[PDB]
Every structure is written in structure tokens, then in C-alpha cells.
Nucleic acid binder design. Structure first.
Lengths: 107, 220, 62, 50, 127
RNA sequence: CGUAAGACUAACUUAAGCGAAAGCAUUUGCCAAAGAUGUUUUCAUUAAUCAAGAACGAAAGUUAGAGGUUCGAAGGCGAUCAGAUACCGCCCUAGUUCUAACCAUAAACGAUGCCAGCUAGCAAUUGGGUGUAGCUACUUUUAUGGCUCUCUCAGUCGCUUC
């Protein structure tokens, strides 16, 4: 049976939409059927940051951030546990939650 | 028939790079070149050096807040142990360009070409964004895709009035003020309220002539 | 070498039960630069160890 | 043809009998077949030189 | 007193290239990568190999005496991973603790305006 | 630092849009076409759907040229494995590329034919219209632009239960 009203995602008024490549897997999965992670990361862990701001000649030199987007195969995002096996009533929730912590995945 | 013996840095002479009469300070840093010979002249193993340097490191803000604006210099002439390093472009740092792209807004580009009174045929990259006027709880503030082509029209005519503008001694002084970015902003807000405008890239794909008669008032 | 090492916190038995109970080691000359090691051995607060390497940080705290 | 009139001519069955790629300076009337050939066979590949 | 190098940390997976140069990059000093230190083919990725073989360059830039320098992190992404590996900035805490004056840190991996085709083939890396 | 070549158009990219469907993303010019909105415009039933028949039809495959980077069935090696014509790793061939034809199939899916009337909430957005001295950029405020809530068409999404 039809497990989702979305199916993948967002395939309405398109017919067929472009694919991207997975990161860990290097698949060719649709752009919309894709776990996407716009990952912002500090370059220097923010725990070895005091070693680096010692060597900063300038005004302690506020650190640049790393920017990427993690297009994921579905079978290779469950495997890396970005997403997991929700309950059938928890399946329906999309926007909640942010609601966790300060800045995650950095650490 | 060379067979260099040990420590090839021993035959390497240090050369400190310089800067023109453009804005400010002269010496920037040092590079190191081999010793002169009849086959390997040190003066011509050295004019293919492009030197990468920021602007706030050279406008001498002790608190560098313009530190997102690299602009390269091409080593061009060897004189008095210190190479001269004429202009080669105006880039912009990676983590300033990549840090402004958060979705929910409109990226407008203008990749434009014009050349000055002297034939430095340079290519300018006017990059802007759209800004959510507050009191709007909508999350997008996206343009109208003919609103885009109307300001992209407007960004290409003013900067091709600026570039044909009495060659770089005026022109790099404009982007050292970002004086186009304060007039590419107030003009286009009759069309759309625009966000941070970053000129983001300049290639200098053509260079007219070497001819140091035009370099002595530019370096001296 | 015999570089001083005092402790702040003893953790869960990470390392998949080698009872490698990690720690956030404090030093003498400073109080703010000090940072994580993942030691082996049961620790009370006040264990003034001396460690060889002050460069390993072992950044997988749990 | 016949072995008098050609390097390749001659046998009972009709064959070249020896390699058809010949040296550059092999000097007529031997320079027949493939004249100083860098490679032979069908090309399976993209060697347009641009 | 400010002389400047460029560290050029090519913080790949399964190696790390701590290859300082002069400012223009045409002249290289102390080519030391993490591969030339340990040889077991699978600890070349480790942050400890990037620990020792980064300040291994810090002595040999003091043979010529360059106090300050700049950093260039590389990922190694083209049509590839686009983010630095494990031993990425453990080679940065190696340098600043080894009596260096580090101000400039930049991610100079470049990113394409779209890739040609990558390795793997539409269902890539099964197992 | 370069020069050269062929590909691919990232990020912005959406529960956005266009298209009959397959499909469609670098600017700029030119070409022809389309929905929708507006309309005290025009004609006056011209419309509905459809055997036969026509036009288009992802990919792959086929012809004939031009290309030939990346990738890569097939093939050739290295491991793993009792076995391994596989997964994993290397150079690669046909192909991907462009042109001029053929082919006519896809989980071509919303597994849901098209025109028509009715039946409900709630929130978002695409497009157009109309009152907000609601704000608001400044030639001076005005003219515009941006949004604000308030309507309104065609909807499309979303969620809640008849």
C-alpha cells in the first residue's frame, strides 16, 4: 500500500525532476527524494580554538565557517543515522523539532 | 650536468615583494628565488609570480573588518632586490561568498566585461541578494525574474560607466572604497530593496603593455 | 614527559568497556587551555597524574 | 599476383605470409603493404588530436 | 617583523599534505606529508600523523626563518567529498603550539558549477 | 602560473513555476507560441468525448557523419571467497556529446481518463486585479518600488475531521 501521501517528496506539477549524487554512497537519487544537510561547521573544533587564537596576530581573528550540503541516498542516510525508522504516527511530522540543543554536529 | 650538492636553499636569494602607488604601504612580504646564472636568470624566473594578499592587511585596519577581500598582484619587474607586483585582479574570500547563500532570498549575478582607457580588459562580477523587509512574516522575499533582469540591466550600465574611467589608479581606489557598491545599491532600490552587494571577482584577462614609463608614476 | 595532569570529571566507561573512563585534564601553569584526554583507570577527583603527551585530545567524549 | 611481381604474391593459398608493415627506409621495390606503420588494427578509441 | 608563508594543508582522506610554500606558491619548502612518517597504509588518515608531520615542517621553515604564515585547507572535493578529513586541523593545533604566528585560515577547496560525472554508476558503492 | 579541449550548468532550489505528456536551470539578443487575470470587446452554439487515423514521446538500442573530458555494460587484470563470470579497485571499448534520420517502449505512476454541476474547515504560496495617506525608497512628500493586513479570480499544496 501507499506508505506516504508524498511518496518521495514534492513530485507535483513536475512529472520528473533532476537527480543529484549521494555523498557516502554516490548514488543518483532525485533532488527532492534526498536527505539534504546544509552543514555549517567551525573549522577548528572550537575546543582547539584557544591554541589558534594565541597565534592570531589580529583582533583574536574570528574564525571562518565550513559550508557544504550533504545530498544523501536514503539507504545511506539511515545507515549513517541522519534519519531513522520513525513510528507510523511520528512518520507524519515534518517541521518539528529544532528544539534540541546548541549547535550540533560540530561538536 | 647540474647535480646540486646539499641544501638548495643556500643558493636562494630572498626578494621582498612591493606594492604600487595605489592606496598605501609598500612592502608586503618576501619570496625566495634561485641564484643567477647564464641559463637560469633570477630576473625571469620571477615575473610569473602571482602574489595572493588581502586588502585589510594592506589598508592597515588594525582591526581587520575588510578582511574578506583578497586581491592578487602579479610580479612584473625585478628592481633593487624587491619585485614590484603590479595589479592582477580583485577576488573575494571563499567564506564570505559561501557564507551569504542562505536560501529564502534571490541571488542576482552580473558577469560584465569592459576595459579602461588603457587596455586592461577586465571582467567584473556584481553579486547581490534580496532582503526581507521587516514587518513581513513571509519567509522568502523573492524577486520576479523580470525584476531580476531589470536590475541586472542596471548593474551592467553603471559599472561599464565606472570601468571606462581613467585606468586603475581611479578604479581600484573605487573598489577600495566599494564606491560602486554604494551606488549599485541606492540606484536599484527604485526597482527592489537590495541586500549586501559584493563585487566578488575581477579577472584582468588582458594586459596592454609592459612599458615602465607608465609604471614610474604608478610606482615611485 | 612528566608533564603534570590533574582531573576535573570522570565519565562513562567508553572505549566499549575497557573501562576507559575519560576525563578533562587540568594543568598547573594555566586554567583555561586545558582539555580532554581519554585515559584508562578509575579516577577520583584530585588524582594528580603526570602525562607524556599534551597534544592528543581524543575528541569523542560520551 | 605471382612472387616475381610483388612481395605478397605467391603461395598456394593466397596470403601475405610475412608482416605487411614494412620499415621506413626499406627502399623499393619492397616498400609495399603498410609503410612505416605506427599501429594497426581497428581503432577502438578517441584519438582526434584536438 | 612580518614574513609570511602559506601552509597549503591538503587534508584529504588517507593522507595529509602539509606542504608550506612561499607566498606565491611557486617555491616550496619542506614537502612533508603524513605519508612519509608512518607506513601502514591505514593510519595515514589519522590526526596523529597530521600531528607530528605538521610541526615537522615547523622546524624546516625556521631554517629559513619565516615567523608568520597562512593556511589553505583543501578537502579534496572536486566531484568528490568537499570537506576535510580526520587529520584536518589537528595539523593546525600542531602548528600554533609549535611557536608560530598563524593568521589566515581559508577553505580553498574549489567547488564546480556542476560536476562532469563522478565514479560509481547510479547505484554506487554497493557494500 | 598557464594554454587547449570536450562535458556539466552546482550553491541560490522551494512541497515554487512552466509544459499536452515525455521534459525544462550560465547570461544576452532575436523568433514564434501559451495559460491566467482584466474587459457595460467581437461572433452566436460554433461546444463534449471519442473507434479509425494523425503529431509528440525518458533512457537504452540502431543507421550516417562530426566529436571524443568525465563516466562506463562488454572485455582484461587484483583481491575476497569452499566457489565469485559478482559486489570493492585500476586503465579503459560501444555508449554519454552534436547533427540528419529511425525506433515507440518506462513503476511513461497520482499504479487514480476528459468536459460539467454540487458539497468545509484551516493555513500557506504562484499569477492577475482592486480599496488600506497600512507602511514606505526618495526627484519634495506625491508618481513608483518593497512589504502590511484586507478582499478577489484560477488554482496548487498542506493539515483536521464529515
Amino acid at each position: 500500500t501507499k506508505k506516504r501521501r508524498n511518496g518521495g517528496r514534492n513530485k507535483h506539477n513536475r512529472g520528473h525532476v533532476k537527480p543529484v549524487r549521494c555523498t557516502n554512497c554516490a548514488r543518483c537519487v532525485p533532488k527532492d527524494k534526498a536527505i539534504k544537510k546544509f552543514v555549517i561547521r567551525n573549522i577548528v573544533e572550537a575546543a582547539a580554538v584557544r591554541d589558534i587564537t594565541e597565534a592570531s596576530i589580529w583582533d583574536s581573528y574570528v574564525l571562518p565557517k565550513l559550508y557544504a550540503k550533504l545530498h544523501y541516498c536514503v539507504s545511506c542516510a539511515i545507515h549513517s543515522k541522519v534519519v531513522r525508522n520513525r513510528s507510523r504516527e511520528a512518520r507524519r511530522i515534518r517541521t518539528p523539532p529544532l528544539r534540541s540543543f546548541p549547535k550540533d554536529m560540530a561538536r | 650536468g647540474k647535480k646540486k650538492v646539499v641544501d638548495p636553499f643556500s643558493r636562494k636569494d630572498w626578494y621582498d615583494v612591493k606594492a604600487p602607488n595605489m592606496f598605501q604601504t609598500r612592502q608586503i612580504g618576501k619570496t625566495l628565488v634561485n641564484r643567477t646564472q647564464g641559463q637560469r636568470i633570477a630576473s625571469d624566473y620571477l615575473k610569473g609570480r602571482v602574489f595572493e594578499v588581502s586588502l585589510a592587511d594592506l589598508q592597515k585596519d588594525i582591526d581587520p573588518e575588510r578582511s574578506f577581500r583578497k586581491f592578487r598582484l602579479i610580479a612584473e619587474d625585478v628592481q633593487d632586490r624587491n619585485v614590484l607586483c603590479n595589479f592582477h585582479g580583485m577576488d573575494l574570500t571563499t567564506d564570505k561568498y559561501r557564507s551569504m547563500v542562505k536560501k529564502w532570498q534571490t541571488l542576482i549575478e552580473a558577469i560584465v566585461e569592459a576595459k579602461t582607457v588603457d587596455g586592461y580588459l577586465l571582467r567584473v562580477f556584481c553579486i547581490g541578494f534580496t532582503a526581507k523587509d521587516q514587518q513581513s512574516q513571509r519567509k522568502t522575499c523573492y524577486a520576479q525574474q523580470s525584476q531580476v533582469r531589470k536590475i541586472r540591466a542596471r548593474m551592467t550600465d553603471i559599472i561599464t560607466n565606472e570601468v571606462s574611467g581613467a585606468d586603475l589608479k581611479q578604479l581600484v581606489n573605487k573598489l577600495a572604497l566599494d564606491s560602486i557598491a554604494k551606488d549599485i545599491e541606492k540606484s536599484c532600490q527604485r526597482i527592489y530593496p537590495l541586500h549586501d552587494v559584493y563585487i566578488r571577482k575581477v579577472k584582468v584577462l588582458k594586459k596592454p603593455r609592459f612599458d615602465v614609463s607608465k609604471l614610474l608614476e604608478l610606482h615611485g | 614527559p612528566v608533564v603534570w595532569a590533574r582531573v576535573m570529571k570522570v565519565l562513562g566507561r567508553t572505549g566499549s568497556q575497557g573501562q576507559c573512563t575519560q576525563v578533562k585534564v587540568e594543568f598547573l601553569g594555566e586554567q583555561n587551555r586545558q582539555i580532554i584526554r581519554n585515559v584508562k583507570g578509575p579516577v577520583r577527583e584530585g588524582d594528580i597524574l603526570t602525562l607524556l603527551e599534551s597534544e592528543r585530545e581524543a575528541r569523542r567524549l560520551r | 599476383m605471382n612472387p616475381v611481381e610483388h612481395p605478397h604474391g605467391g603461395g598456394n593459398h593466397q596470403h601475405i605470409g610475412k608482416a605487411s608493415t614494412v620499415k621506413r627506409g626499406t627502399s623499393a621495390g619492397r616498400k609495399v603493404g603498410l609503410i612505416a606503420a605506427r599501429r594497426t588494427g581497428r581503432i577502438r578509441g578517441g584519438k582526434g588530436d584536438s | 617583523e612580518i614574513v609570511f608563508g602559506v601552509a597549503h594543508i591538503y587534508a584529504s582522506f588517507n593522507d595529509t599534505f602539509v606542504h608550506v610554500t612561499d607566498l606565491s606558491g611557486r617555491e616550496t619548502i619542506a614537502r612533508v606529508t603524513g605519508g612519509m612518517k608512518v607506513k601502514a597504509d591505514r593510519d595515514e588518515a589519522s590526526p596523529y600523523a597530521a600531528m607530528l608531520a605538521a610541526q615537522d615542517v615547523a622546524e624546516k621553515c625556521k631554517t629559513l626563518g619565516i615567523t608568520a604564515l597562512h593556511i589553505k585547507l583543501r578537502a579534496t572535493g572536486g566531484n568528490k567529498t568537499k570537506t576535510p578529513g580526520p587529520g584536518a586541523q589537528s595539523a593546525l593545533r600542531a602548528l600554533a603550539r609549535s611557536s608560530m604566528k598563524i593568521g589566515r585560515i581559508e577553505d580553498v577547496t574549489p567547488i564546480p558549477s556542476d560536476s562532469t560525472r563522478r565514479k560509481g554508476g547510479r547505484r554506487g558503492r554497493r557494500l
